[PDB]
Amino acid sequence: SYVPHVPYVPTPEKVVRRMLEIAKVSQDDIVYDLGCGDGRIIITAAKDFNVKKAVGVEINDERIREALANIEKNGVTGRASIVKGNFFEVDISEATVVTMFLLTNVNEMLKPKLEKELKPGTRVVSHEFEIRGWNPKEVIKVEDGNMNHTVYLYVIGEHK
């Protein structure tokens, strides 16, 4: 379709693990990755963090096939799934943890949806990009070799 430009660029695995640690993801959680790419975040959530449910939303068909293929080869089909669609339109209200690696302007556009649909205490973790106008509970630097990454953690209902 015709959604704001957000190309496929994945979060490095070390940053993926740190985003989930920072949000304190556990078995009780329901993790949504908005724009899931190859599915690495929801697969790590299910496989390493034992989450009861992980859902990736993805609009690109080639990416959906890779993600579904990755879910199968990791054996997590029970708990991890993909929703084909525009993340702007898909209901994310069941999420207890939402992960994002998008763009600051796309973060901006998502602000009404996040506030509308997410319950208080929902944690939202963003790789690299700020949610402008919100106050993060934490801002963390993650070193992956000689690369530095910033991770933002917000908590719905304590973000303003």
Ligand SMILES: Nc1ncnc2c1ncn2[C@@H]1O[C@H](CSCC[C@H](N)C(=O)O)[C@@H](O)[C@H]1O
């Ligand atoms: N409006 C939209 N709805 C669903 N997916 C989208 C989207 N806009 C971009 N995407 C997808 O979101 C992905 C962003 S790349 C980030 C992938 C993953 N969250 C990670 O951190 O590794 C791309 O695969 C792109 O196809």
Ligand SMILES: [Mg+2]
């Ligand atoms: Mg980065």
